[PDB]
Amino acid sequence: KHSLPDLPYDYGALEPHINAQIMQLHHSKQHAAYVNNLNVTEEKYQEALAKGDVTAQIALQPALKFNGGGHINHSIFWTNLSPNGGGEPKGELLEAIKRDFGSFDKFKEKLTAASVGVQGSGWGWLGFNKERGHLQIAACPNQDPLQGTTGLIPLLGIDVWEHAYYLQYKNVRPDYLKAIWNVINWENVTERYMACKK
Amino acid sequence: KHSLPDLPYDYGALEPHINAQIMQLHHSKQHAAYVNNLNVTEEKYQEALAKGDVTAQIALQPALKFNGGGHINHSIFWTNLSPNGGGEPKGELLEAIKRDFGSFDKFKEKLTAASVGVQGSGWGWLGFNKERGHLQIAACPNQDPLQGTTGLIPLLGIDVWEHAYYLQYKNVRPDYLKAIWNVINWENVTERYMACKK
Amino acid sequence: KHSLPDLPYDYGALEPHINAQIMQLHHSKQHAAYVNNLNVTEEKYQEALAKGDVTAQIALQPALKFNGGGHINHSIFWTNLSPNGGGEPKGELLEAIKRDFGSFDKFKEKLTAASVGVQGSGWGWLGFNKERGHLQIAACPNQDPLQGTTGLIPLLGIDVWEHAYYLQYKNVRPDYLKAIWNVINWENVTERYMACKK
Amino acid sequence: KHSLPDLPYDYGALEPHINAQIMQLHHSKQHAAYVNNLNVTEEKYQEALAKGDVTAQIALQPALKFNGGGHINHSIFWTNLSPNGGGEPKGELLEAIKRDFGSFDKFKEKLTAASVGVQGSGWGWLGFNKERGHLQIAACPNQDPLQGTTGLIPLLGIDVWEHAYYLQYKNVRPDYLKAIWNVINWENVTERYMACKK
Ligand SMILES: [Mn+2]
Ligand SMILES: [Mn+2]
Ligand SMILES: [Mn+2]
Numbered sequence: 001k002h003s004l005p006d007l008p009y010d011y012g013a014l015e016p017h018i019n020a021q022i023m024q025l026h027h028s029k030q031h032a033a034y035v036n037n038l039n040v041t042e043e044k045y046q047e048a049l050a051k052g053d054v055t056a057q058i059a060l061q062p063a064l065k066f067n068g069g070g071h072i073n074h075s076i077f078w079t080n081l082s083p084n085g086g087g088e089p090k091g092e093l094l095e096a097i098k099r100d101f102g103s104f105d106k107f108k109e110k111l112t113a114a115s116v117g118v119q120g121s122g123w124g125w126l127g128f129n130k131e132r133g134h135l136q137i138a139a140c141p142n143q144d145p146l147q148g149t150t151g152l153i154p155l156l157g158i159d160v161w162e163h164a165y166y167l168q169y170k171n172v173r174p175d176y177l178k179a180i181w182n183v184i185n186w187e188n189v190t191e192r193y194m195a196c197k198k
Numbered sequence: 199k200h201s202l203p204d205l206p207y208d209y210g211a212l213e214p215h216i217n218a219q220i221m222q223l224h225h226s227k228q229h230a231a232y233v234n235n236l237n238v239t240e241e242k243y244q245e246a247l248a249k250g251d252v253t254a255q256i257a258l259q260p261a262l263k264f265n266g267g268g269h270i271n272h273s274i275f276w277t278n279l280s281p282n283g284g285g286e287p288k289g290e291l292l293e294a295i296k297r298d299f300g301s302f303d304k305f306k307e308k309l310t311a312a313s314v315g316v317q318g319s320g321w322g323w324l325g326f327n328k329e330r331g332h333l334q335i336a337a338c339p340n341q342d343p344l345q346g347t348t349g350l351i352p353l354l355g356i357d358v359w360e361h362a363y364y365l366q367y368k369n370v371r372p373d374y375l376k377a378i379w380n381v382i383n384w385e386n387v388t389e390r391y392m393a394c395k396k
Numbered sequence: 397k398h399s400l401p402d403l404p405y406d407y408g409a410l411e412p413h414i415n416a417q418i419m420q421l422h423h424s425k426q427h428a429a430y431v432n433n434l435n436v437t438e439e440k441y442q443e444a445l446a447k448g449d450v451t452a453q454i455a456l457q458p459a460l461k462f463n464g465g466g467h468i469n470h471s472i473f474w475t476n477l478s479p480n481g482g483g484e485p486k487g488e489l490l491e492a493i494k495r496d497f498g499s500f501d502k503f504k505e506k507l508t509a510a511s512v513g514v515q516g517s518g519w520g521w522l523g524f525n526k527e528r529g530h531l532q533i534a535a536c537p538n539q540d541p542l543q544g545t546t547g548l549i550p551l552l553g554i555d556v557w558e559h560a561y562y563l564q565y566k567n568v569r570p571d572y573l574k575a576i577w578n579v580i581n582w583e584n585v586t587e588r589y590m591a592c593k594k
Numbered sequence: 595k596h597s598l599p600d601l602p603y604d605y606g607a608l609e610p611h612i613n614a615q616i617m618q619l620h621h622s623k624q625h626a627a628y629v630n631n632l633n634v635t636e637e638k639y640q641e642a643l644a645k646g647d648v649t650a651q652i653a654l655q656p657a658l659k660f661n662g663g664g665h666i667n668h669s670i671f672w673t674n675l676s677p678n679g680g681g682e683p684k685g686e687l688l689e690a691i692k693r694d695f696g697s698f699d700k701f702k703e704k705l706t707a708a709s710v711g712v713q714g715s716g717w718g719w720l721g722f723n724k725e726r727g728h729l730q731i732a733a734c735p736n737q738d739p740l741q742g743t744t745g746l747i748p749l750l751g752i753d754v755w756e757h758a759y760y761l762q763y764k765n766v767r768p769d770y771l772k773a774i775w776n777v778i779n780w781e782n783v784t785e786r787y788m789a790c791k792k
C-alpha cells in the first residue's frame with residue numbers, strides 16, 4: 001500500500017519562486033491522486049496476475065506507469081527542493097557536473113533546454129548513468145519515471161507539466177525554470193549522487 | 199504563411215464556463231506560438247526538401263506535427279464554441295448522434311470520458327469516419343491533429359491540456375468538461391458534419 | 397503457469413499456402429519462447445509487486461507486453477487456421493461482414509490493406525468492438541495484443557512479421573496475404589464472433 | 595531525386611557470413627523500393643507544403659520517415675560492410691572505443707545486446723554524440739534513422755530486421771550478429787568517425 005509522503009516543508013516555504021497555491025494543489029491534489037490510483041491499479045494487477053489474465057495485465061499497463069510514475073517522480077521532486085536551497089553544489093558532484101557538462105551554468109543551460117523542450121506534459125532530469133560512470137541529462141514524457149523507462153538514476157527532477165507553474169507563470173515556462181534554480185536542494189541531490197556513485 | 203485567426207467573439211464571451219483570462223492567454227499566447235513556430239518549421243522544411251536532406255526533414259517532424267497540429271486544433275476549437283451555444287444539435291446530426299451513441303447524454307458521457315481519460319496533454323474529439331459512414335469519438339495526444347493522425351474528420355474538439363482550464367478549474371478537469379457543454383456551437387459542428395456527409 | 401498450446405493440425409497441414417517449415421519453427425521455436433519468457437516475467441512481477449517496487453514493475457512492461465502478447469496472438473493465430481479452411485463465413489458473421497464492411501470481398505481487401513499496411517513487425521486484426529456493437533479492423537505493432545491494447549475482441553488475426561512468410565513468399569507480403577485466405581478457419585472465427593455477441 | 599547507391603562489392607562478396615541471396619534481395623529489391631517511395635513521398639510533400647496543407651504534411655510523416663530512413667540506413671549499411679572487413683579498428687577510433695566502452699570486446703558485447711535487444715524490426719547503432727563528444731550506442735525501431743531521430747552521427751549500423759538474416763540464420767539472431775562482425779568495414783567506420791571529430 002502506497003502512501004502520499006508528507007512534504008519536507010511548508011507549502012509556502014518555496015515563495016516566491018513556486019507559490020503556495022501551486023504547492024498545495026500539486027501535493028494535496030495531483031500527487032494524492034497518483035498515489036490513490038496507483039494503489040488501485042496495483043491491487044487490480046495482483047488480481048490479473050493471480051489468475052493468469054495476460055490481457056488484463058497488459059491493459060493495466062498505461063495506468064500503472066502513469067500513476068506509478070507520477071508517484072515516483074513527485075516524491076523525488078519534493079526532496080529536490082528546499083527553502084534554504086539555491087546556489088551550486090560542491091565536492092565531487094560539482095566536479096562531476098563541471099566535468100560532464102563543462103561548467104555549472106552550462107549544466108543549467110542544458111537542463112533548462114531539456115525541460116523547456118518538452119512538448120506537452122513531462123519532466124526534465126539530471127541523472128546518473130551507472131553503465132557510463134558519468135552524469136546525464138534526459139527528458140521524460142508525461143509521468144514516465146526516469147529509472148523505470150531509461151535506467152538512469154534520478155538526481156534532480158524538474159516537473160514541466162503545466163499544473164506545475166501555469167497558475168503563477170502562466171504560459172512562460174522559461175520564467176518557471178529560471179525561478180526554480182533558487183530552491184534546488186543540492187544537499188539531497190548530492191546524497192542521491194554519492195548514493196549511486198558507489 | 200500561416201496566420202493566427204481572429205476569434206469569432208469576445209475573449210470574455212464564454213463567461214462563466216471558460217473565463218476571459220484563459221481565453222486571452224489561450225488565443226494570444228498559446229495559439230500564437232504554434233502559428234509562429236509552425237511558420238518557422240515549414241520554412242525550414244522547404245529548405246531541407248529543396249536540398250534533399252532527408253535527415254533534416256525527419257528531425258523537423260516532431261516540431262511540425264506539434265506546432266502544425268496546435269494550429270489546426272485551436273483554429274477549430276474557437277469555432278466550436280459560442281456565447282449563444284449550448285443545448286443540443288438538431289436535424290441529421292442529432293439523429294446521427296442518437297443513432298451512433300444511443301442518446302445525446304450518452305454521447306456527452308462518452309466524449310466526456312474520452313477527454314477526462316487523456317493522461318497528460320491532449321484533446322477529446324467527436325469525428326466523422328468517412329469510410330464507415332458513421333460518427334466516432336477519439337482522443338489525441340499532445341497536439342496531434344485528428345484528421346492528420348487518424349483520418350477522421352473533426353466536428354467538435356475539446357482541448358484538455360491543463361492550460362485550457364487550470365487557472366479556473368484547477369485540477370478538477372471534470373468540472374471543466376461539464377462546464378463546456380454550455381458553449382458548444384452546434385451550428386458550426388453541424389456545418390462540419392453536413393460538410394463531410396457529402 | 398501459462399502453457400504451450402498443441403497445434404490444432406500437423407505442421408504441414410497447410411501446404412502449399414504456408415509450408416510445414418514456417419509452421420514448424422513459428423510454433424515449436426518462437427511460440428514456446430514467448431510462453432517461457434512470459435512465465436519468467438510474471439514471476440519477476442509477483443516479486444516486484446510484493447516489494448512495492450514500482451520502478452521494477454514499469455521496467456518489466458516491455459517484456460510482459462511483448463512475451464504475453466506474443467503468446468496471446470499466436471495462440472489465437474493457430475486456431476484461426478485449418479486444413480479445411482478457406483472460402484468464407486456463413487450466418488451472422490457473414491451478415492455482419494457484409495453490413496459492416498459492404499461485402500466479404502471489400503472486407504478481405506480491408507484486412508489485407510491493414511495487414512499489408514504494417515510498416516515493420518506487427519499484426520492485422522479482425523476484431524469486434526463491444527462498445528459500438530459491430531466488427532472493426534485494426535493493426536497492432538510487434539506483439540501488442542489486440543484486446544489488451546485496444547479493447548477489441550479478436551476474431552481473426554494475421555501475423556505479418558517477416559518470420560511468418562519471408563522464407564516462402566520472400567519480401568512480397570501480398571503473396572502471403574493472398575495465400576493465407578485459403579487457410580483461414582472460418583469455423584473458429586465464428587465461434588469467437590458468437591462468444592461476444594450475446 | 596534521391597538515387598540507389600551501387601553496392602560497394604558483389605552480392606556474394608560476403609560469403610559465408612551473409613549469403614549473396616540476402617544481399618541480392620535486400621539491395622536490389624528493398625533498398626530500391628525505399629528510394630522510389632521516398633521520391634514519391636517528397637513530391638507529395640512539396641505539393642502539400644506549397645498548398646499550406648498541414649494536415650496532409652502530417653499524414654505524410656510515417657511514409658517519409660519510413661522510406662527516407664530506410665534509404666538512409668541501408669545506404670550506410672552497405673558501406674559498413676566489406677569483403678576484407680573484420681577484426682577491429684585502429685588509431686583514434688579504437689582508442690575511443692576502449693575509453694568509452696572499456697574494450698573493443700565489451701563494445702561488441704554492447705552493440706550486440708543493443709542489436710539483439712530490438713524487439714520487432716529495427717537497427718542497432720554505433721553513433722557519435724556531438725554534444726558530449728564521445729561514442730554512444732543506440733537502437734532504433736523500424737526504419738527510424740539514427741541522426742534524424744536522436745541527433746547522433748551514425749558510424750556503424752547493424753540491420754536487425756528479420757529480412758536481414760532469417761533466410762540464413764533463421765530465428766536465431768545472435769548467430770547473425772556473431773557472423774556479421776567478420777564483415778564490418780572498419781575502414782569506413784573510421785572515416786565516418788573522423789568526419790565528425792574535428
Ligand atoms: Mn506534477
Ligand atoms: Mn490549447
Ligand atoms: Mn509470429
Ligand SMILES: [Mn+2]
Binds near residue numbers: 620753757
Ligand atoms: Mn533492411
